[PDB]
Amino acid sequence: ADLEDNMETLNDNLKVIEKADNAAQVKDALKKMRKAALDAKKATPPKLEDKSPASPEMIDFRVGFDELAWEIHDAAHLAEKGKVKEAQAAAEQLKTTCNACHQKYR
Amino acid sequence: ADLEDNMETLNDNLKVIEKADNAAQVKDALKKMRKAALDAKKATPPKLEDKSPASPEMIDFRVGFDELAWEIHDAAHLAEKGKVKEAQAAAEQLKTTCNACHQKYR
Amino acid sequence: ADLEDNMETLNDNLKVIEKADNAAQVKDALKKMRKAALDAKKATPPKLEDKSPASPEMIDFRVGFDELAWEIHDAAHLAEKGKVKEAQAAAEQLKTTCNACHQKYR
Numbered sequence: 173a174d175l176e177d178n179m180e181t182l183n184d185n186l187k188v189i190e191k192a193d194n195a196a197q198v199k200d201a202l203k204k205m206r207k208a209a210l211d212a213k214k215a216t217p218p219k220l221e222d223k224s225p226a227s228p229e230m231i232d233f234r235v236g237f238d239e240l241a242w243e244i245h246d247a248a249h250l251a252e253k254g255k256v257k258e259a260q261a262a263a264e265q266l267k268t269t270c271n272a273c274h275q276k277y278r
Numbered sequence: 279a280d281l282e283d284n285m286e287t288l289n290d291n292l293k294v295i296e297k298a299d300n301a302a303q304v305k306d307a308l309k310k311m312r313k314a315a316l317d318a319k320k321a322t323p324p325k326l327e328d329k330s331p332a333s334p335e336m337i338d339f340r341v342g343f344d345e346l347a348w349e350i351h352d353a354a355h356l357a358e359k360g361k362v363k364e365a366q367a368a369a370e371q372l373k374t375t376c377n378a379c380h381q382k383y384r
Numbered sequence: 385a386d387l388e389d390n391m392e393t394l395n396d397n398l399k400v401i402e403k404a405d406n407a408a409q410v411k412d413a414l415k416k417m418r419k420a421a422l423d424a425k426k427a428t429p430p431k432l433e434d435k436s437p438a439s440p441e442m443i444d445f446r447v448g449f450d451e452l453a454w455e456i457h458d459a460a461h462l463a464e465k466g467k468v469k470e471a472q473a474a475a476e477q478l479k480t481t482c483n484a485c486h487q488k489y490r
């Protein structure tokens with residue numbers, strides 16, 4: 173999928189997690205975020221189309237999705253230990269990672 | 279190890295997992311797959327030797343191993359909860375990720 | 385942070401883990417290592433400054449941090465099951481991955 177669709181998947185599943193009522197809903201949404209995050213990592217964002225494909229900005233951009241994916245996995249660890257409300261709080265904390273990339277490249 | 283060796287390791291351990299009799303055999307084989315997947319990520323496949331090293335195809339290629347490593351990890355989570363049959367089924371499902379890359383770059 | 389700050393973080397938290405007294409201290413230190421590992425992945429090490437940004441050495445370098453992050457996570461799994469001493473042993477074993485990269489690019 174393209175970058176925008178992957179971002180909407182990220183945003184949609186954050187709101188699913190917030191409203192989720194059991195561990196299985198959280199874990200399924202988190203899996204969809206991780207998939208979207210890895211798929212977004214294949215893209216060139218519009219503000220970096222003029223840079224080299226392995227410029228430090230494109231590397232930083234791509235590693236940003238590794239960091240997002242690992243943080244998502246931390247939340248997944250909380251959810252499958254049954255710590256649903258802790259997992260939902262960790263999901264909401266992902267926004268600091270969303271924001272950090274946006275302020276640089278969005 | 280070179281790309282072909284890593285691919286044989288991936289294929290060999292898929293069959294070890296299929297025939298495994300306990301969680302420890304599944305976990306050990308999945309670990310060897312993840313290692314092989316990350317090692318394969320360092321290579322240039324023959325069909326992409328003419329593209330630039332960070333072309334969209336080489337990025338798609340490299341991220342394909344991230345996707346495979348995470349999917350392997352999902353199976354390891356099943357095997358660590360002692361859900362051996364589920365872990366074996368998830369390992370069989372990895373083939374859709376194997377295939378998807380092959381049809382583009384093999 | 386820059387590359388050498390991330391390396392000091394990696395080295396400091398290895399010593400924290402060696403001296404840790406409970407799972408929480410191991411888990412917290414491992415997570416600082418993973419973060420530092422992914423951040424170091426964004427850098428160009430002095431010995432590769434003259435190489436192409438996606439040369440096979442820079443790819444090998446960056447994948448070295450994926451391998452390090454996954455090995456850290458393996459130790460994190462041990463510590464999350466309360467196997468504190470096994471987690472500490474695995475953290476010591478990380479040094480073979482530290483060394484392997486240093487001998488090539490440090």
Ligand code: HEC
Binds near residue numbers: 292342373376380
């Ligand atoms: C891309 C992201 C890939 C993923 C994921 C997997 N494979 Fe693969 N494979 C890929 C390429 C580009 C090649 C060509 C290698 C060459 O130099 O010819 C291959 C090759 C194989 C082979 C045959 C290797 C040989 O005998 O010479 C096998 C058996 C194989 N791949 C298996 C395999 C499996 C089981 C995977 C998932 C678990 C898998 N591959 C992932 C690219 C990619």
Ligand code: HEC
Binds near residue numbers: 387388394446448489
């Ligand atoms: C590559 C894939 C590496 C891995 C994995 C690890 N390190 Fe590293 N390290 C690497 C380089 C290229 C450098 C040179 C940095 C420079 O700017 O000169 C380093 C450096 C260090 C240092 C010294 C840093 C300093 O004090 O200036 C230390 C203490 C260090 N590295 C430790 C370390 C540990 C403990 C690792 C594993 C847990 C590790 N490194 C991994 C490249 C790579």
Ligand code: HEC
Binds near residue numbers: 180236240269273
């Ligand atoms: C970089 C490493 C990013 C991370 C991590 C996240 N996002 Fe992002 N996002 C990024 C870019 C470069 C763009 C611009 C895309 C474009 O083509 O214009 C975006 C965009 C979005 C959007 C808007 C998409 C749209 O509706 O057109 C949303 C809603 C969005 N991003 C949300 C989002 C969330 C919730 C993230 C993590 C929790 C996140 N993004 C991570 C770059 C990066």
Ligand SMILES: [Ca+2]
Binds near residue numbers: 173211214
């Ligand atoms: Ca896509």
Ligand SMILES: [Ca+2]
Binds near residue numbers: 176
């Ligand atoms: Ca839009």
Ligand SMILES: [Ca+2]
Binds near residue numbers: 191192193
């Ligand atoms: Ca609800």
Ligand SMILES: [Ca+2]
Binds near residue numbers: 279280317
């Ligand atoms: Ca190799």
Ligand SMILES: [Ca+2]
Binds near residue numbers: 299
């Ligand atoms: Ca058997």
Ligand SMILES: [Ca+2]
Binds near residue numbers: 358
């Ligand atoms: Ca677990």
Ligand SMILES: [Ca+2]
Binds near residue numbers: 385386423426
């Ligand atoms: Ca940094």
Ligand SMILES: [Ca+2]
Binds near residue numbers: 388
């Ligand atoms: Ca120093």
Ligand SMILES: [Ca+2]
Binds near residue numbers: 388
């Ligand atoms: Ca110094």
Ligand SMILES: [Cl-]
Binds near residue numbers: 206
């Ligand atoms: Cl996850």
Ligand SMILES: [Cl-]
Binds near residue numbers: 438
């Ligand atoms: Cl790259």
Ligand SMILES: [Cl-]
Binds near residue numbers: 234340446
């Ligand atoms: Cl990468």
Ligand SMILES: [Cl-]
Binds near residue numbers: 309312350351354
């Ligand atoms: Cl794994």
